[PDB]
Design a binder for these strands. Structure first.
Ligand SMILES: C[n+]1cn([C@@H]2O[C@H](COP(=O)(O)OP(=O)(O)OP(=O)(O)OC[C@H]3O[C@@H](n4cnc5c(=O)[nH]c(N)nc54)[C@H](O)[C@@H]3O)[C@@H](O)[C@H]2O)c2nc(N)[nH]c(=O)c21
Ligand SMILES: Nc1ncnc2c1ncn2[C@@H]1O[C@H](CSCC[C@H](N)C(=O)O)[C@@H](O)[C@H]1O
Ligand SMILES: Nc1ncnc2c1ncn2[C@@H]1O[C@H](CSCC[C@H](N)C(=O)O)[C@@H](O)[C@H]1O
Lengths: 293, 285
RNA sequence: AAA
């Protein structure tokens, strides 16, 4: 790995300052180096999103509606974290697949086995209104093959718009991965929001998280798709294979450097002599729960 | 506006008997009124031919679909059994919620999705209604007309109603094929819209494609401009009705083909109740 | 996402 000095990592997509032509050979590298790296990827991004809402004082008293939550192993850590902080949250996890049994026996966590559609979204809105809803969507459908088709993505993203216009959440975190330019079909629309980059995403994933706080929609064109492809490939090929030699941490690889800056936003009841001691404690706690050495 | 004197309105595109060269260029909820009338006319025709009862209406491009609630109630109250499948990429009007015979689907439709819903709707007879459109470039239209064609060839419906608006010749690209059918003109369409509804009834799996040429695009633009500038701005004075503007005269003759359980003294009385009913549902004072 |  190449060495580099950095004052900060790229937190949002628009900070990526270079592009590189996608090489299809990338699909052969190991996608997830760490065990349960997907749960880790989700835990860090959702801890980041929710801690920002806690910062703005809108998290306390809210109901987090998480659609596409199964198996959701990491959600148990997320829930325990805010419960131990004394934040009053109710959890509603909805997925057609069964959830991880580690989520059982929690009074503030309602498990629902169902694929959501427009009719069902209206019923849970009427049930939860007038309480604050925070939406987390990680839905993904697939029709055969080995990867989702562009039609599957367009249907998923249309559904995520339906979630927003019906649930009317105070804030939302949406799965966002643009269709690749060679599989384009039609322009489509997604909400406004910040495009949070994900440490410990798959090695060459172009997925990010669309974070919005609500106080319209934007068109996505094929030229945007080309831009996403080249920017994320530079990020995955070059940036995430750097060692940050000025970074004071046991692991200096970029993804740990990136994770570090996200964990700095997290609240904690325990006091620490240094910020590093806090982050190191949080990281080992996350890794231990997820069975990562 | 201008005073007129007619015996019947222009019901289909072929009846337009004059052209006119183009030039650059509205009730509340007129778009829902336009769709309601055209679909009530199409489905009533199917009721007369006895192929409506027991069918599934596959409506692609249905949102928001406010007027569909009126159609569903109209035929339901008559004892006609219709199942409704409304498929779109955005959500529908809440007035469609809570109806067990109406299924709301959020999906971007492609060929493979059509095949799967064909399998799951079997053995029901299918009635297709398509109003798909993207937020128009000629290429967008050709894309939608290509999709509407595979809707028919895959779903094998007993009848279909297709959105049909020819690309303008100053935006022509290449010839394309559309199904054979009757080109129904729509009252209360936009003042200078060239859009009509293509209505087809199939038997023996006889589907026939017809070429659309650049010369056709000119003949559409000319005939529709004569209809939009001349025919529709007239006032049929020999028409016994509270409103004699040509659109209501057009609508009057469409609503006359609509069944109703209530008896009436005059046929005028029946159409006046239907129009008042349709306006009162759509909140059109 | 997990394997
Ligand atoms: C008649 N004419 C107009 N222009 C000019 O060219 C353009 C065509 O507009 P137009 O209104 O004629 O287009 P349409 O597709 O019919 O309607 P349109 O309003 O485009 O589409 C309406 C439909 O869109 C759909 N729709 C409505 N809202 C939405 C939405 O939010 N999303 C999506 N996806 N579809 C929507 C729905 O199906 C609705 O009925 C305009 O600039 C005209 O002035 C002409 N130009 C030339 N050279 N020659 C002509 O003869 C001519
Ligand atoms: N319409 C729908 N409603 C709810 N969940 C859906 C859905 N379509 C797809 N999904 C779910 O989307 C998920 C994508 S993977 C989600 C992983 C999950 N966030 C975790 O923490 O492990 C799948 O579990 C799938 O069942
Ligand atoms: N491939 C596709 N799959 C599903 N819906 C589509 C589509 N392409 C376009 N549409 C839908 O086509 C619609 C055109 S407007 C339709 C209005 C509707 N007939 C009503 O009664 O209100 C849009 O809502 C759009 O989302």
């Amino acid at each position: 790995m190449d060495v580099v000095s950095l004052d900060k990592p790229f937190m949002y997509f628009e900070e990526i300052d270079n592009e590189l032509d996608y090489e299809p050979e990338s699909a052969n590298e190991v996608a997830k180096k760490l065990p349960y790296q997907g749960q880790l990827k989700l835990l860090l991004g959702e801890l980041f999103f929710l801690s920002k809402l806690q910062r703005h004082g809108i998290l306390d008293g809210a109901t987090v509606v998480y659609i596409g939550s199964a198996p959701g192993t990491h959600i148990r850590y997320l829930r325990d974290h805010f419960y131990n902080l004394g934040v009053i949250i109710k959890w509603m996890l909805i997925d057609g697949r069964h959830h991880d049994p580690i989520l059982n026996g929690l009074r503030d966590v309602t498990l629902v086995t169902r694929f959501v559609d427009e009719e069902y979204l209206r019923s849970i809105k009427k049930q939860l209104h007038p309480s604050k809803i925070i939406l987390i969507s990680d839905v993904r459908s697939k029709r055969g093959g080995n990867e989702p088709s562009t039609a599957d993505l367009l249907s998923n993203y249309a559904l995520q718009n339906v979630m927003i216009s019906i649930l009317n959440p105070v804030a939302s975190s949406l799965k966002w991965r643009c269709p690749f330019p060679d599989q384009w079909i039609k322009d489509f629309y997604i909400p406004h929001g910040n495009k949070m980059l994900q440490p410990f995403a798959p090695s060459y994933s172009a997925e990010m998280r669309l974070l919005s706080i609500y106080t319209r929609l934007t068109r996505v064109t094929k030229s945007d798709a080309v831009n996403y492809e080249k920017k994320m490939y530079y990020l995955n090929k070059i940036v995430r294979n750097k060692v940050v030699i000025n970074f004071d941490y046991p692991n200096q690889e970029y993804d740990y450097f990136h994770m570090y800056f996200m964990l700095r936003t997290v609240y904690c009841n325990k006091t620490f002599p240094t910020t590093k001691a806090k982050i190191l404690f949080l990281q080992q706690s996350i890794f231990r729960f997820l069975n990562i050495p």
